[PDB]
Amino acid sequence: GPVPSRARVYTDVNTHRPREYWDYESHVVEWGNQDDYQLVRKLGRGKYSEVFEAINITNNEKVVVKILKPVKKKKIKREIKILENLRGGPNIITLADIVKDPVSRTPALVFEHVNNTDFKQLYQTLTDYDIRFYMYEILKALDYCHSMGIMHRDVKPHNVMIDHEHRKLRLIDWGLAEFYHPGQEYNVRVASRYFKGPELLVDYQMYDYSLDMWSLGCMLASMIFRKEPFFHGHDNYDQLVRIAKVLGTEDLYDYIDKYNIELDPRFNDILGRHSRKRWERFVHSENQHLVSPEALDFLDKLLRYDHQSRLTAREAMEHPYFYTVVKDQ
């Protein structure tokens, strides 16, 4: 049996909320008017939805319509309930409406427009200052959702939408997000490969908000080092090997030993023996202007095998790395 684990913050947020807050299966969807929205341009198709630019004819404002289709039907009410719970929070995408699409016969979520950009397009060209600035903005979103008893579970550049002109950021795509209940076992098949925490990669199910902080660290490493992605696995197994080649195998074994986790024997022929590397290994003439002692220390404190040892969102906002960033107002 593995050793149990609990979040060290916001542990019992949901246990003290009304049933209707986290019992998303019981949620009753309020439907708006589908005729308010005219689709203009198809923007993307994910595994679980199609995304359209549209216009709201009631106000002639541009909007984004996400037509849900998921193979897991429960995710519908889960995403809706989460978005309604977090509506108005700092840097959280605002669900503006929910309509029944006439063609698909499924719910369509209507969001505020975030003109026009992630970020995976910009985040490799940002200045040092801008990296710090945007990291702090993402932290505001993550502390908010965590404090509300929700983990995002899919933090990656594509889910961070940035309007660089107004220096505005939104965390999007809450389709994988879940309510944190102490002791609950969760599905390890979440997040995108390069952003998956070691807990997912070693099949440890009792994870928490701290999963998002690993993903954030992967983002930070890619930005300051100009290496996209930072941990570049060819599959979920090689993903752990790539991590171990940086953080070392001794700390990995210490982590799995702490929680009495047994590695998939698949790793015996592939993991090898790796020392922990000093972060300076990844610094070179082309990224050095983005690296500082503060950045490296901050990164070191996010990219920890032990999910319990990582900085929380709040602690991360306290870090010296953010001292140079102008606080509003």
Ligand SMILES: O=C(O)c1cc2cc3ccc4oc(C(=O)O)cc4c3cc2o1
């Ligand atoms: O130009 C583009 O390709 C483009 C622009 C664009 C704007 C978006 C604004 C809000 C969103 O919320 C979600 C969500 O999944 O909640 C996805 C999106 C979303 C996806 C997008 O793709």
